[PDB]
Amino acid sequence: HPGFALTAVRTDTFEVDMLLYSGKSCTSVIINNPIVTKEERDISTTYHV
């Protein structure tokens, strides 16, 4: 045993479910009409909405 000691730290990841709660009309979401931009890869024309 050399003079010093070690104190290893180690993070561990837990997959987990989680339950949210929020009040009635806690927040508004103002929205506009969706829109369609156009792009062209010349093999197929992607669109974006």
Partner 1 sequence: AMEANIFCTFDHKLSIADVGKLTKLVAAVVPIPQRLHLIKHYQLGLHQFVDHTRGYVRLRGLLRNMTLTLMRRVEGNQILLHVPTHGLLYTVLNTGPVTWEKGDALCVLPPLFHGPLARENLLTLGQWELVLPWIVPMPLALEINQRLLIMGLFSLDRSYEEVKAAVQQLQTITFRDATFTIPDPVIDQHLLIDMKTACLSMSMVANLASELTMTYVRKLALEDSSMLLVKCQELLMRLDRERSVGEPRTPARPQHVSPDDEIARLSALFVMLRQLDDLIREQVVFTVCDVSPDNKSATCIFKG
Partner 2 sequence: MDARAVAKRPRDPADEDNELVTALKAKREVNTISVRYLYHADHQALTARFFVPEGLVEFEAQPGALLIRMETGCDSPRHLYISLYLLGIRASNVSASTRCLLESVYTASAARAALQWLDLGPHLLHRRLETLGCVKTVSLGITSLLTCVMRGYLYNTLKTEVFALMIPKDMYLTWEETRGRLQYVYLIIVYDYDGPETRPGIYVLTSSIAHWQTLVDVARGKFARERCSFVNRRITRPRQIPLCTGVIQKLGWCLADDIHTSFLVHKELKLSVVRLDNFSVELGDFREFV
Partner 3 sequence: FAATHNPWASQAGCLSDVLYNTRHRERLGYNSKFYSPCAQYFNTEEIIA
Phi, psi of 47 (to 5 degrees): -125, 165
Phi, psi of 9 (to 5 degrees): -110, 155
CB of 5 to partner 2, least distance (A): 30
CB of 22 to partner 3, least distance (A): 29
Under rule CB under 8 A, residue 22 binds partner 3: no
Identity of the residue, 13 or 46, whose beta carbon is nearer to partner 2 in the bound complex = 46
Q: Any residues with CB less than 8 A from the CB of 49 and at least 6 apart, and which?
A: 34, 35, 36
Indicate which single residue of 7, 27, 37, 44 sits in contact with partner 3 (rule: CB under 8 A).
Answer: 7
